[PDB]
Design a protein around this ligand. Structure first.
Ligand SMILES: CC(C)CCC[C@@H](C)[C@H]1CC[C@H]2[C@@H]3CC=C4C[C@@H](O)CC[C@]4(C)[C@H]3CC[C@]12C
Ligand SMILES: CC(C)CCC[C@@H](C)[C@H]1CC[C@H]2[C@@H]3CC=C4C[C@@H](O)CC[C@]4(C)[C@H]3CC[C@]12C
Ligand SMILES: CCCCCCC(C)(C)c1ccc([C@@H]2C[C@H](O)CC[C@H]2CCCO)c(O)c1
Ligand SMILES: Cc1ccc2c([C@@H](C[N+](=O)[O-])c3cccs3)c(-c3ccccc3)[nH]c2c1
Ligand SMILES: CCCCCCCC/C=C/CCCCCCCC(=O)OC[C@H](O)CO
Ligand SMILES: CCCCCCCC/C=C\CCCCCCCC(=O)OC[C@H](O)CO
Length: 486
């Protein structure tokens, strides 16, 4: 009885009473879960000055409201239509459906603003607090929400199959198929780009790395800066002098123990060598490992170490030793440099990869890789600089390391919580955006109408799992909620 383009609204009521009771109870319990969780998310954010001031939680707050407002309007209208068989006019029905559409596109746009926010953090790292001001983020969210609702109000104002005498959708009453066409594409292109963006943010974040500062904390030093040095040197060197430590492997053309072994030889003729002391550590290529051990007893002020050392034994090594040399050819992550600066060792390093990004002029001395003579000058510039008080510089490494590590470790987490929110949105709404595309070109049998009715519950699942993501993936939410509820 419903083959007409202007079909009766009864033919969208595609569910049988046992099916309605199941969908109803599932809608109510699932919806009740979303309500309780999302108002809890908002209350934690809204009632804390330290939270609501960050545009990161304007974004979390945005998703919370987008979930809360859309799901509540949906569950009320969805089951009122299906179980109570509501017979609302074309305007009021399109008005209720509009509230559900505005809420979803607001989430795609809230995801979109976050993608832009991270994009400019990667492309212009130095200008981020000035370009993403809190007020700029507030209005960027504000208008985004308005453009969202405007798209939702177009059918109400006349873009529908009744006012236009066009073709009606078989899923959505009164809705024009051409407006349906337009709506999928607009969120499909955003969601598609957001997918590309979020993968790029996650790749770029993993290009940097940080260390656990608990293991590499200075608090574990048991002795003064000069005395803790003397004793460790006393175990072998038994003298007081500036010490240059190396901790890597003995490959040729990678970590740069080759460049170091050539360097040390040309400092040996100089008189100032006696002030210097060196400690080489690691295991590697048999041709050059003996080269170091041929030099452990030839000059006698150097301990080369071939066997491994526990990561908790070397924390005291980094703190007492005056200098660490990183003559690497490739170092996208200066993890060894980070652990040294985190214990106060001043780093002389190659200008390669992270070493260049981490160490600046105020923290250490940078030398072109592959030139051992330039390295020989580095520890000579480190000799004339060692006599003058360099504790004013020793602490530049103390805070540069602990701050660089926390920006790299942070950015990793944002990139993870982002994609977590994305994938759950895709597998919840992907099926829904597929059944509508099957409607744009095609026809809905009574079956595809029924499964889409049952599949519409996914929008309430998505709204319920999002607060769980924030709860697990945000130590800040946790401490705020924890302090509110002892
Ligand atoms: C009308 C029915 C269906 C829903 C009622 C709840 C509405 C009115 C509530 C729920 C959550 C609320 C939002 C929660 C937080 C903020 C951020 C604040 O900086 C401005 C107000 C704003 C944006 C609120 C506006 C009103 C709001 C959207
Ligand atoms: C379909 C919907 C989701 C599209 C959303 C469009 C969003 C991403 C666009 C539309 C209007 C835009 C804003 C318009 C003007 C300004 C002021 C400017 O000084 C900074 C950028 C800012 C704040 C823009 C940010 C991005 C913005 C909010
Ligand atoms: C028009 C843009 C689509 C937005 C997706 C909304 C969603 C997929 C969640 C949805 C919306 C509406 C319905 C029901 C379809 C029935 O054909 C008629 C009654 C609708 C519920 C009342 C909406 O206020 C749905 O199953 C899924
Ligand atoms: C039952 C109900 C409650 C609220 C709404 C809204 C607005 C809120 N206000 O009352 O209009 C919003 C819903 C979600 C975010 S904003 C629309 C709406 C939105 C845009 C265009 C057309 C209609 N329909 C609704 C239906
Ligand atoms: C549920 C959806 C609503 C979301 C609203 C947020 C609710 C988060 C409350 C969480 C569990 C409490 C766990 C205890 C909190 C501390 C966890 C922690 O990691 O503490 C580490 C600490 O720094 C050690 O030094
Ligand atoms: C129809 C409704 C449209 C939906 C729109 C959703 C936008 C909400 C986004 C985020 C919440 C983040 C919390 C923002 C609260 C900031 C309050 C604040 O910080 O006040 C400053 C003052 O200085 C304090 O002491």
């Amino acid at each position: 009885q419903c083959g007409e383009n202007f079909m009766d609204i009864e033919c969208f009521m595609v569910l049988n009473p046992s099916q309605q009771l199941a969908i109803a109870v599932l809608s109510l319990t699932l919806g009740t879960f979303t309500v309780l969780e999302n108002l809890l998310v908002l209350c934690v954010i809204l009632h804390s000055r330290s939270l609501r001031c960050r545009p990161s939680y304007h974004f979390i707050g945005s998703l919370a409201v987008a979930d809360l407002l859309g799901s509540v309007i949906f569950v009320y209208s969805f089951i009122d239509f299906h179980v109570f068989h509501r017979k609302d006019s074309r305007n009021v029905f399109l008005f209720k459906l509009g509230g559900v559409t505005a809420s979803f596109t607001a989430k795609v746009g809230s995801l979109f603003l976050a993608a832009i926010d991270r994009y400019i953090s990667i492309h212009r790292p130095l200008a981020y607090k000035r370009i993403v001001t809190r007020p700029k983020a507030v209005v960027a969210f504000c208008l985004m929400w308005t453009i969202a609702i405007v798209i939702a109000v177009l059918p109400l104002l006349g873009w529908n199959c009744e006012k236009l005498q066009s073709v009606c959708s078989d899923i959505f009453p009164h809705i024009d198929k051409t407006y349906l066409m337009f709506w999928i594409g607009v969120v499909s292109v955003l969601l598609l780009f957001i997918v590309y963006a979020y993968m790029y943010i996650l790749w770029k974040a993993h290009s940097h790395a940080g260390i656990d500062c608990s293991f590499w904390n200075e608090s574990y030093l048991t002795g003064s800066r000069d005395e803790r040095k003397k004793s460790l040197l006393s175990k072998f060197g038994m003298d007081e002098g500036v010490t240059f430590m190396f901790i890597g492997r003995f490959d040729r053309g990678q970590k740069g123990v080759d460049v170091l072994l050539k360097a040390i030889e040309i400092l040996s003729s100089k008189k100032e060598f006696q002030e210097m002391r060196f400690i080489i550590i690691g295991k590697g290529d048999p041709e050059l490992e003996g080269w170091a051990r041929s030099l452990e007893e030839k000059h006698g002020n150097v301990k080369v170490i071939t066997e491994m050392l526990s990561r908790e034994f070397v924390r005291e090594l980094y703190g007492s030793v005056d200098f660490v040399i990183i003559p690497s050819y490739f170092e996208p992550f200066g993890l060894v440099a980070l652990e040294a600066m985190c214990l106060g060792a001043i780093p002389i390093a190659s200008a390669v990869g992270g070493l260049r990004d981490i160490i600046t002029n105020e923290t250490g001395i940078l030398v072109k890789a592959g030139d051992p003579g330039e390295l020989a000058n580095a520890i000579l510039k480190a000799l004339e600089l060692s006599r003058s008080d360099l504790s004013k510089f020793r602490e530049n490494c103390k805070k540069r390391a602990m701050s660089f590590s926390d920006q790299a470790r942070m950015d990793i987490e944002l990139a993870k919580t982002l994609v977590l929110i994305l994938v759950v949105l895709i597998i919840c709404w992907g099926p829904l955006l597929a059944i509508m595309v099957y409607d744009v070109f095609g026809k809905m049998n009574k079956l595809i109408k029924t499964v889409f009715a049952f599949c519409s519950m996914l929008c309430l699942l998505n709204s319920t799992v999002d607060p769980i993501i924030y709860a697990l993936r945000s130590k800040d939410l946790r401490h705020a909620f924890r302090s509110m509820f002892p």
